[PDB]
Design a binder for this molecule. Structure first.
Ligand SMILES: OC[C@H]1O[C@H](O[C@H]2[C@H](O)[C@@H](O)[C@H](OCCCCCCC3CCCCC3)O[C@@H]2CO)[C@H](O)[C@@H](O)[C@@H]1O
Ligand SMILES: *C(=O)/C=C/N[C@@H](C(=O)O)[C@](C)(Cn1ccnn1)[SH](=O)=O
Length: 265
């Protein structure tokens, strides 16, 4: 594979779309690669990680408990609820809801959680409170990935998302236990985690949340590194490409391969 930046360019050329990417040291925030890092991209399902960071903040403040059981109704379910559709009789705890939203991308779980933090506006206010003045959530789980051109709703920038994830995971804004919980939820991703490990060389750590939307929208927020360490945050978003899901997946994997082969920069 070529250098990361050359591979990113090849991906835009092959996809006919825009790629946005940031590679950042998790411990220090050192930016290694930045391409269209200040441009907007639909967050898609990656918003679920920020969502649970807001939930954890409420737990830390004593305004929420991960143990609290929420009972909901079938009428509350939206498209794609693999875990939540199984608990109409007994409910789910707030912590189980975050695990379902992040590790399974359960949309009903995400919407139930979103209501607890004040809806899209409340999550956006939380983002402003931690210093992210760019990322914005405007719609609920099954409408936020429409990806209309020129539509600023439900978007982030690679730089903003990377900085925000770093703040949630390492800045002590969240308690030690909450930081550890948010990280473990990403380590536990069932949607893409196992697949990524299957193609990663031995020794590489992965934690992640992926997303997909219309007009080719695709993305991943991840922690990656050799020696089984979460050394860097890598955020990659794709938008406005008519390519098949397989090819968008392949191009993102290709950027990952360039990173893996040329890690020491
Ligand atoms: O020399 C480095 C490595 O080169 C190859 O590894 C390949 C691997 O066989 C392939 O499957 C992967 O594809 C990349 C898979 C990436 C999957 C997703 C990565 C995510 C993670 C973070 C966010 C963006 C993308 O590339 C590496 C590097 O060429 C060799 O197989 C391996 O033995 C060797 O140690
Ligand atoms: C988050 O990015 C969600 C994207 N796609 C979802 C959806 O729109 O709700 C579906 C259900 C695919 N999916 C399942 C699990 N992760 N993604 S839709 O694109 O089929």
């Amino acid at each position: 594979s070529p250098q990361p930046l050359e591979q990113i360019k090849l991906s835009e050329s092959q996809l006919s779309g825009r790629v946005g990417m940031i590679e950042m040291d998790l411990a220090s925030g050192r930016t290694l690669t930045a391409w269209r890092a200040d441009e907007r991209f639909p967050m898609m399902s990656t918003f679920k990680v920020v969502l649970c960071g807001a939930v954890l903040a409420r737990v830390d403040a004593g305004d929420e408990q991960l143990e609290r059981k929420i009972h909901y109704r079938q009428q509350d379910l939206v498209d794609y609820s693999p875990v939540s559709e199984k608990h109409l009789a007994d409910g789910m705890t707030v912590g189980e809801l975050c695990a379902a939203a992040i590790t399974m991308s359960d949309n009903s779980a995400a919407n139930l959680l979103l209501a607890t933090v004040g809806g899209p506006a409340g999550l956006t206010a939380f983002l402003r409170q931690i210093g992210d003045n760019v990322t914005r959530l405007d719609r609920w789980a099954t409408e936020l990935n429409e990806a209309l051109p020129g539509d600023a709703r439900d978007t982030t920038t690679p730089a903003s998302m990377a900085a925000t994830l770093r703040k949630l995971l390492t800045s002590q804004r969240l308690s030690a236990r909450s930081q550890r919980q948010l990280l473990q939820w990403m380590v536990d991703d069932r949607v893409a985690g196992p697949l990524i490990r299957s193609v990663l060389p031995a020794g590489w750590f992965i934690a992640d949340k992926t997303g997909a939307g219309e007009r080719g929208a695709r993305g991943i927020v991840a922690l990656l590194g050799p020696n089984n360490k979460a050394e860097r945050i890598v955020v990659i978003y794709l938008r406005d490409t008519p390519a098949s899901m397989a090819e968008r997946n392949q191009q993102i994997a290709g950027i990952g391969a360039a990173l893996i082969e040329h890690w020491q920069r």
